């Protein structure tokens, strides 16, 4: 339907839910309008998420050879990867569990007039 490019950032050490809070700002926006929402968004997941939209636009510019002023984030989502299990010691001998969660972030930009 449209020419496109894909970029994946596997094993990003941001939680999947705290990454989904920030991908819902830039879904369906143009790339020049998405890399500056993520600049002035105070959340910390906008670091790793904006390094994938910028590389999906760099993959569509170099490899496919597309005009960068017409791109748009057509499909972006975040999944989970593996989880490390840690121990946080608590009162009266109880030992609880901490989960270090990771993510996979997929951005599919596309060129459309």
């Amino acid at each position: 339907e449209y020419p496109s490019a894909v970029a994946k950032a596997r094993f990003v050490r941001v939680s999947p839910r705290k990454a989904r809070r920030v991908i819902d700002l830039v879904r369906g926006r143009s790339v020049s309008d998405a890399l500056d929402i993520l600049r002035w968004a105070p959340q910390a997941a906008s670091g790793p998420v904006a390094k994938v939209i910028a590389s999906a636009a760099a993959n569509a510019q170099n490899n496919g050879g597309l005009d960068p002023a017409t791109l748009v984030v057509a499909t972006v989502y975040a999944d989970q990867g593996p989880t490390a299990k840690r121990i946080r010691p608590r009162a009266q001998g109880r030992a609880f569990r901490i989960r270090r969660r990771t993510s996979h972030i997929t951005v599919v930009v596309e060129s459309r007039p």
Binding site: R21, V22, D24, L25, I37, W40, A41, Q43
Partner: protein, 54 residues
């Protein structure tokens, strides 16, 4: 108090969808001939070189 019963898939999604970041507004800045985007509350420091645009 403890949860008496686990919440079903329709009550744990109606609450969780309300935890979300609010987007900010962006305005236009032309300093040093390069057009950028800042929020309006930082419009003064954009025209004084106090904003690092990375």
């Amino acid at each position: 108090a403890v949860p008496k019963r686990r919440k079903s898939r329709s009550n744990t999604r109606s609450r969780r969808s309300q935890w979300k970041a609010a987007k900010t507004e962006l305005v236009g800045v032309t300093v040093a001939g390069h057009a950028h985007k800042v929020p309006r509350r930082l419009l003064k420091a954009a025209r004084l070189g106090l904003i690092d645009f990375d």
